[PDB]
Amino acid sequence: IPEKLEYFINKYAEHSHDKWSMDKLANGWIYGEIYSDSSKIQPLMLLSEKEKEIYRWPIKESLKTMLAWDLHAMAEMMAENYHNIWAKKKKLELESKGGGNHPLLVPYDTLTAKEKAKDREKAQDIFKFLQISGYVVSRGXXXXXXXXXXXXXXXXXXXXXXXXXXX
């Protein structure tokens, strides 16, 4: 990973903190030492410091994925990355602890239209954050050509027919 992408990760963390703090001021949450969800006190003003820390790694993983591998296509591909790693973890823990079957034990195509939006929300967020800076990424006539190919095929067929007539 390059160093100004190292910058970009810190800038993303900062702006995610700014959006979360916008939510904090919108809902009127106030900081405190004690941890609780009903009394409206937070040690990092719901989220623990670890519980914001954890969102640091999946961005790096998805970014490595985009580096090793249009806009909506990359969005749904990052969303599929998220859902695939989520399904992998859930399947491993199910086969580990003997858990029951989940309704998400299906491929990404048969799935419903709602989880689509659920997994594309943050994908669109990080993609906005990506295009704000300037870094542009991608995946990494025809009729005339088809007509020409058909003509060549017809010529070959005519040659074959002439040969057959000779035979």
UniProtKB/Swiss-Prot annotation:
Disruption phenotype: Embryonically lethal. Embryos die at about 10 dpc, due to defects in heart tube development. Cardiac myotubes display enlarged rough endoplasmic reticulum and cytoplasmic vesicles that contain high levels of Ca(2+). Highly expressed in heart, lung, cerebellum and brain. Detected at lower levels in adrenal gland, stomach, thymus, esophagus and ovary. Channel activity is modulated by phosphorylation. Phosphorylation is increased in failing heart, leading to calcium leaks and increased cytoplasmic Ca(2+) levels. It comes from the Eukaryota. It is found in: Sarcoplasmic reticulum membrane. Sequence repeats lie at residues 70-140. The calcium release channel activity resides in the C-terminal region while the remaining part of the protein resides in the cytoplasm. Cytosolic calcium-activated calcium channel that mediates the release of Ca(2+) from the sarcoplasmic reticulum into the cytosol and thereby plays a key role in triggering cardiac muscle contraction. Aberrant channel activation can lead to cardiac arrhythmia. In cardiac myocytes, calcium release is triggered by increased Ca(2+) cytosolic levels due to activation of the L-type calcium channel CACNA1C. The calcium channel activity is modulated by formation of heterotetramers with RYR3. Required for cellular calcium ion homeostasis. Required for embryonic heart development. Belongs to the ryanodine receptor (TC 1.A.3.1) family. RYR2 subfamily. Homotetramer. Can also form heterotetramers with RYR1 and RYR3. Interacts with CALM and S100A1; these interactions regulate channel activity. Identified in a complex composed of RYR2, FKBP1B, PKA catalytic subunit, PRKAR2A, AKAP6, and the protein phosphatases PP2A and PP1. Interacts directly with FKBP1B, PKA, PP1 and PP2A. Interacts with FKBP1A and FKBP1B; these interactions may stabilize the channel in its closed state and prevent Ca(2+) leaks. Interacts with SELENON. Identified in a complex, composed of FSD2, CMYA5 and RYR2. This is Ryanodine receptor 2. It comes from Mus musculus. The chain holds residues 2712 to 2905 of 4966 of the full protein.
